[PDB]
Amino acid sequence: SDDFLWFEGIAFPTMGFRSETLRKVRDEFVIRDEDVIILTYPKSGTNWLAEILCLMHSKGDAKWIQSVPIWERSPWVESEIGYTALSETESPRLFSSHLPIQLFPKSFFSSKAKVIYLMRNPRDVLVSGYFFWKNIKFIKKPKSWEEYFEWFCQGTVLYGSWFDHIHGWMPMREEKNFLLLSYEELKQDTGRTIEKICQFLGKTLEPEELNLILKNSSFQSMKEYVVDKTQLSGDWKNHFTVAQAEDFDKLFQEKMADLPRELFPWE
Ligand SMILES: C[C@]12CC[C@H](O)C[C@@H]1CC[C@@H]1[C@@H]2CC[C@]2(C)C(=O)CC[C@@H]12
């Protein structure tokens, strides 16, 4: 009764996943140079980014996108339902993945498949994870906020350390098939970000298609198994005590020292 799937030093949700699949993801899954993958540490804005991409493909028409659910528009390759769908989908394929770099498909590293990595202020990530995860059945829950705070800081949470996750993927930030984005810039100005994604993917849009896309992909438009139905707010400053914040800056400072500080927009 540990309440999670432990695999290669990383904890995964009990339901929906299996070791044998995780093993195949890294050893067998074949990636195509035409595939596009959304890479994120859980709760960093994957859905929003999935929306933008789906809208870009549908030229703004929020038709299909409306009916089709998240895990179907950009399924998670590491999940059962995910691995299966991707295994029988015809390129071009759009899929998501929270996997740290050392467990990602081997085939990827010799391909031209394009990857978009989205990162977010870890403070917001920790809060969203707290409220999201503590509201999901069968997965180990924290006895309290203070406790979850400690797990996140020590890496003992689903998908592992946020710090490790960023360190492992950052070394590719300059590859031509790797686009690095921040949730912060995504929110500050979707237009600018959409333009980067178009440039990175080599897509072009008619002024009127962009118009529609910009409208269906604004933060407001985004505002759209489970314990309590309710929670399905504020900011990290409404949860972190001043002491937790001072302790987190310190930890962040120590942990990210070997990486350019200006790589991270937030304070
Ligand atoms: C938990 C999560 C991956 C961690 C995410 O940021 C929160 C996501 C909720 C939907 C889950 C997904 C894992 C794979 C699942 C189980 C599927 O294949 C369909 C429902 C999917």
What would the 3-class secondary structure string for the chain be? CCCCEEECCEEECCCCCCHHHHHHHHHCCCCCCCCEEEEECCCCCHHHHHHHHHHHHCCCCCHHHHHCCHHHHCCECCCHHHHHHHHCCCCCCEEEECCCHHHCCHHHHHCCCEEEEEECCHHHHHHHHHHHHCCECCCCCCCCHHHHHHHHHHCCCECCCHHHHHHHHHHHCCCCCEEEEEHHHHHHCHHHHHHHHHHHHCCCCCHHHHHHHHHHCCHHHHCCCECCCCCCCCCHHHCCCHHHHHHHHHHHHHHCCCCCHHHCCCC
Q: Which domains does the chain have, with CATH numbers?
A: 1-267 (3.40.50.300)
Of ligand 1's listed atoms, the one at least distance from the Cα of 17 is 16
Among 12, 47, 76, residue to substitute to test ligand 1 (most atoms within 8 Å of Cβ): 76
**Which residue has its alpha carbon closest to ligand 1 atom 8?**
42
Asked whether 132 and 43 are in contact (CB, 8 A), the reply is: yes
Of ligand 1's listed atoms, the one at least distance from the Cα of 47 is 6
Among 71, 78, 134, residue to substitute to test ligand 1 (most atoms within 8 Å of Cβ): 71
User: Per the annotation, does 162 bind a ligand?
Assistant: no
Dist. CA 23 → ligand 1 center (Å): 18
Dist. CA 78 → ligand 1 center (Å): 10
Pairing of strands 36-40, 114-119: parallel
**Number of other residues whose CB lies within 10 A of the CB of residue 127:** 24
What residues flank ligand 1, with Cβ below 6 Å?
13, 16, 42-43, 46, 71, 76, 79, 81-82, 98
**Which residue has its alpha carbon closest to ligand 1 atom 5?**
42
Dist. CA 131 → ligand 1 center (Å): 15
User: Per the annotation, does 45 bind a ligand?
Assistant: yes
Distance CA 52, CA 190 (A): 9
Neighbour-count burial for 185-206, b at 16+ CB within 10 Å, e otherwise: ebeeebeebbeebeebeeeebe
Distance CA 200, CA 50 (A): 15
Of ligand 1's listed atoms, the one at least distance from the Cα of 71 is 19
Can the peptide bond before residue 92 be classed as cis, meaning omega within 30 degrees of 0?
A: yes
Structure tokens at 63: 């038709």
Distance CA 264, CA 267 (A): 8
**Which residue has its alpha carbon closest to ligand 1 atom 21?**
71
- The resolution, in Å, is 2.6
**Residue numbers annotated as active site:** 98
Distance CA 24, CA 26 (A): 5
Asked whether 96 and 38 are in contact (CB, 8 A), the reply is: yes
Give the position of tokens 């074949």.
30
Distance CA 84, CA 77 (A): 8
Q: What angle do CA 75, 80, 85 make, to 5 degrees?
A: 50
Distance CA 14, CA 140 (A): 9
